[PDB]
Amino acid sequence: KSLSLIAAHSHITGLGLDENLQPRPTSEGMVGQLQARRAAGVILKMVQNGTIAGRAVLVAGPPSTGKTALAMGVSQSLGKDVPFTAIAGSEIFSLELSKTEALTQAFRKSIGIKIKEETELIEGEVVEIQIDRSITGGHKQGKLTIKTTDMETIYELGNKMIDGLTKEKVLAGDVISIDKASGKITKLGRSFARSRFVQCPEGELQKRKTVVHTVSLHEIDVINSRTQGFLALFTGDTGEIRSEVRDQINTKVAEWKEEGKAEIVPGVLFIDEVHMLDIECFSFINRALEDEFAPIVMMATNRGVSKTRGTNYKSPHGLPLDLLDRSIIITTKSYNEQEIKTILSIRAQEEEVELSSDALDLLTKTGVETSLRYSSNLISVAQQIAMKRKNNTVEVEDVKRAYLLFLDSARSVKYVQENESQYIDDQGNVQISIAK
Amino acid sequence: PKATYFSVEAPPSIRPAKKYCDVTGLKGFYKSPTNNIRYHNAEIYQLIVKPMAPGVDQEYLKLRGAN
Ligand SMILES: Nc1ncnc2c1ncn2[C@@H]1O[C@H](COP(=O)(O)OP(=O)(O)O)[C@@H](O)[C@H]1O
Q1: Three-state secondary structure along A294-322?
Q2: A10, A64, A342, A373: residue to mutate for ligand 1 pocket, most atoms within 8 A of CB
Q3: Residues of chain B positioned with their CB less than 8 A from the CB of A145
Q4: Which residues cross the membrane (chain A)?
Q5: What's the gap in Å between A40 CA and the centre of ligand 1?
Q6: Which of A173, A179, A169 is nearest to A198 (CA)?
Q7: Cβ of A153 and B41 within 8 Å?
Q8: Which of A83, A128, A213, A303 fits a disulfide with A318 by CB distance 3.0 to 4.6 angstroms?
Q9: What CA–CA distances, in Å, run from A78 to A11, A56, A74, A267?
Q10: Selection from A401, A390, A410 nearest residue A359 by Cα
Q11: How far apart are CA A361 and CA A370, in angstroms?
């Protein structure tokens, strides 16, 4: 979860679907768009099956109809250990990488390899550490008493353990985890000996464990591309990875899958506002889904018959015809009054204290009249002016005050229209002075 | 210098010998500090090594000749 404040899509904890993919009317924070939500459930079951490679879905509809909400719901219902990359249309125009290179990196970030590895680990509490540091030469010796709830034992320590325990200075009572293969001790904390604190470890010292590792193909590509280390994964200067190391990694991944020591986990790549990509990017996407190691691409757009960038003609959805041929389209519709009321109810329930019912009806009326998003943005400022009035609930008059202060789009457009000479136009003409 | 009965004595090995549990005989991963007893795991420790009646540790070590 890391550090998370309250955001726009924070209430969505996944698709509200049953076992037969029939959508509940209101579940997991999401309400309405039942045909679209059933389609997203079918696509989710595609990704969870993981036997289908390189399909594209186009979530198209009017603005503020929940397309990004649908994609966030798919990402939440997918869970972890399955890769998900959400990029926008303005990300891939890179000043160092080419457009197809950035698209290839985003394609390969959403394909994952799952490796099961069994390691060795010794973790307990130090009763007492002694060192017989009579260093006549370079040799030194010492003994270590390490305890858990069911173990109590003494160890004879070699020289390299004495070097490893001199740094990361372990006192008596500290809790340490030892990797015998690499010789890296980690100081988890101090046990309950106050007279940062951690619990004393449970029994069975020297216990093997399985740590399931999932890495994407982009990281393996960065590692195998020899002149860029793993610091390229943080610095971002990977810099035009060649095709031959990609081919080598694909052959090695096929070998690992065949011989059974690695499992491939497909993921979902989401492109928000796909209409800003150029026709070159559409061509590379057009021919990029035929690779077997290609994820399930989600595209979301809210444009009509518009021009395609890099060309001069108009095309449906802002996309060329062959890309529309290579994708199935999920349609989404707008919201009526009850859906707006339910959405505002959920967002106000999570975001803040409760509302009076007439205030909620006024929010629903404003959301029908102007915009859903405008009412959802009015909720918090109405609550803040309610706290400034020192009242717990949010009344109608706080909403009236916030409606008077914060304008929607239509009132701003109209008020721009009656006050034209005060503003700057396309031709750069403006009457700053108020007299005559 | 040469002798018969003492020069045919086998010298100690240079390779370090394998460590074994005193009561079970598997790998002695652990040795108890108070008891100086090699033991295999936790239930062996709490079932034999802790409630052992005193004077038995020396006859334990007598098998390895460390008493
Ligand atoms: N079906 C829904 N359930 C819950 N919240 C929704 C739903 N549809 C839209 N919203 C909310 O409306 C707000 C704006 O919707 P948004 O996702 O931007 O629509 P779009 O993706 O169509 O632009 C978001 O905060 C979102 O949570």
Answers
A1: CCEEEEEECCCCEECCCCCCEEHHHCCHH
A2: A64
A3: 33
A4: none
A5: 15
A6: A173
A7: no
A8: A303
A9: 16, 17, 6, 9
A10: A401
A11: 14
Neighbouring-strand partners of residue A12: none
- Distance from the Cα of residue A77 to its chain's centroid: 12
Burial of A55 (0-12, 13-18, 19+ CB in 10 A): middle
Measured in whole angstroms, the distance separating CA A34 from the mean position of its chain's CA atoms is 24
**In 10 A of CB A366, how many CB atoms?**
20
The residue among A362, A402, A365 whose CA lies nearest residue A386 is A402
Residues of A contacting chain B (CB within 8 angstroms): 127, 145, 150-155, 203-206
Residue with tokens 């988890």: A188
The answer to the question of whether A65 is labelled as a binding residue is: yes
- Is the torsion defined by CA of A66, A334, A64, A376 positive or negative? negative
CA pair distance B35, B30, nearest whole angstrom: 11
Return phi, psi of residue A285, to 5°: -70, -35
* B45 at A interface, C-beta within 8 A: yes
**Interrupted backbone of chain A, residues before each interruption (C–N > 2.5 Å):** 195
**CA–CA distance, A376 with A380 (Å, rounded to integer):** 8
Distance in angstroms (rounded) separating the CA atoms of residues A398 and A235: 48
Asked whether A281 and A92 are in contact (CB, 8 A), the reply is: yes
Residue of chain A minimizing CA distance to B47: A150
What single DSSP character describes residue A221?
Answer: H
**CB atoms near residue A201 (< 10 Å):** 22
| CA A54/CA A52 separation, integer angstroms | 7
Locate breaks in chain B with C to N over 2.5 A; list the residue preceding each.
none
HSE, side-chain direction, 13 A CA sphere, residue B30: 28
CA A195 to chain CA mean position, Å: 44
Other CB atoms within a 10 A radius of the CB of residue A143 amount to 14
Q: If you compute the radius of gyration of chain B from its CA atoms, what whole number of angstroms results?
A: 16
Q: What is the resolution of this structure in A?
A: 3.5
At position B11, the amino acid (one-letter code) is P
> If you measure from the C-alpha of residue B7 to the centroid of ligand 1, how many angstroms do you get, rounded to a whole number?
93
In whole angstroms, give the CA distance from residue A55 to residue A298: 9
- Residues in chain A within 8 Å Cβ distance of B41: 204
